[PDB]
Amino acid sequence: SLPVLQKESVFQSGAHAYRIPALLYLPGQQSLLAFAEQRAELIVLRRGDYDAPTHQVQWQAQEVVAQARLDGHRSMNPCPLYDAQTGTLFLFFIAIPGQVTEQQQLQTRANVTRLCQVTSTDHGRTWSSPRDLTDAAIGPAYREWSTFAVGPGHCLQLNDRARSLVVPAYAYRKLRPIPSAFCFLSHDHGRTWARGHFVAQDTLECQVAEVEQRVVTLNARSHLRARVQAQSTNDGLDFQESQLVKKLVEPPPQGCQGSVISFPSPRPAQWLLYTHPTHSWQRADLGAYLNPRPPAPEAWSEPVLLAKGSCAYSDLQSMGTGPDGSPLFGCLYEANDYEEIVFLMFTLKQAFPAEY
Numbered sequence: 490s491l492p493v494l495q496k497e498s499v500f501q502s503g504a505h506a507y508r509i510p511a512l513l514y515l516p517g518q519q520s521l522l523a524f525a526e527q528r529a530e531l532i533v534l535r536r537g538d539y540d541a542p543t544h545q546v547q548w549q550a551q552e553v554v555a556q557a558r559l560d561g562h563r564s565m566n567p568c569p570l571y572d573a574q575t576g577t578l579f580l581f582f583i584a585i586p587g588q589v590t591e592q593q594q595l596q597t598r599a600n601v602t603r604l605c606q607v608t609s610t611d612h613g614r615t616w617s618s619p620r621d622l623t624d625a626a627i628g629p630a631y632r633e634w635s636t637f638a639v640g641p642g643h644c645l646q647l648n649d650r651a652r653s654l655v656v657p658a659y660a661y662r663k664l665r666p667i668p669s670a671f672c673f674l675s676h677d678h679g680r681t682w683a684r685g686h687f688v689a690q691d692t693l694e695c696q697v698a699e700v701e702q703r704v705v706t707l708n709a710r711s712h713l714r715a716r717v718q719a720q721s722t723n724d725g726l727d728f729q730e731s732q733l734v735k736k737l738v739e740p741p742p743q744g745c746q747g748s749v750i751s752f753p754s755p756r757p758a759q760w761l762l763y764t765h766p767t768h769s770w771q772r773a774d775l776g777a778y779l780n781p782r783p784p785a786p787e788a789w790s791e792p793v794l795l796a797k798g799s800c801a802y803s804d805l806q807s808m809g810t811g812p813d814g815s816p817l818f819g820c821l822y823e824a825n826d827y828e829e830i831v832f833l834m835f836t837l838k839q840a841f842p843a844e845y
């Protein structure tokens with residue numbers, strides 16, 4: 490394990506069970522928003538204020554994102570998104586009928602999953618009513634899908650003309666059900682939602698990052714022994730290029746979700762950071778990977794050990810300049826056989842004292 494600034498558990502599986510973390514930074518108020526699935530069942534949230542003096546994050550009391558649900562459906566895969574332009578907070582998620590499951594939908598081929606979002610204009614303190622965007626965003630294609638999902642994890646807003654909203658997703662499309670990664674795009678600040686195109690075969694949960702002319706790189710889990718990296722030159726509408734990244738291992742089963750963010754290069758305008766279990770055959774040993782010449786896959790560094798032991802899902806968030814003057818990061822990840830979601834806060838200089 491690497492020397493960090495903070496390591497506290499934001500969610501602990503005691504009187505309840507938590508999974509599928511989601512982190513979101515608010516640069517204006519230097520606050521983090523920690524989302525997670527509670528039991529699926531509901532989506533909880535926990536705001537934690539970053540205190541500069543102690544180089545700490547004081548986490549407030551958690552709460553149930555109540556409106557983030559649909560009667561008779563259970564909520565899953567929280568995907569927070571902050572529109573800097575309008576200062577609107579978006580929380581996407583997936584709603585599934587009562588006890589129905591993924592395998593039930595995959596085997597039955599009867600998609601019943603629902604794409605939703607709630608928004609907050611006072612920083613997730615209170616939320617708008619749920620807006621079911623299924624039909625409008627997916628359209629006819631919905632009948633060709635056995636099921637689909639968003640995130641989990643932070644979404645992405647672009648620096649293009651419209652400051653477009655990008656939401657990573659994947660779906661089991663028919664051709665027998667094959668999963669593919671794609672993005673839901675909004676060029677009107679969430680007003681309306683189009684649906685981008687798919688990547689090469691077999692790609693599940695994924696996250697997107699931007700980098701500078703302007704390409705959106707996607708990192709998705711696969712059933713292969715590695716991660717798949719797709720690049721879009723038309724803002725996520727199409728991901729023309731797609732490669733398997735050998736250095737980015739994926740545990741045996743069907744892989745494990747991962748997280749990728751972009752941040753200000755110390756010297757391309759950005760660099761990429763990526764967290765994922767590094768262990769060879771099991772979900773353990775969460776590692777951090779650095780790409781100093783993005784999107785070049787062969788530019789991916791070796792992982793740096795973040796946490797030894799059982800580590801599954803994760804979500805990263807850039808948090809501006811850290812104490813040592815280098816980039817500061819916030820990492821939300823599942824640990825100890827899903828008995829808790831641990832928060833980690835460290836700097837570039839702390840994780841990669843060489844490439845700095």
Ligand SMILES: CC(=O)N[C@H]1[C@H]([C@H](O)[C@H](O)CO)OC(C(=O)O)=C[C@@H]1NC(=N)N
Nearest residue numbers: 509526529565566591638693694744745
């Ligand atoms: C919606 C849903 O069923 N999400 C699954 C996810 C999913 O099965 C894979 O990405 C591909 O099907 O896998 C895993 C997983 O641990 O591999 C947990 C997620 N669980 C929850 N979000 N509750």
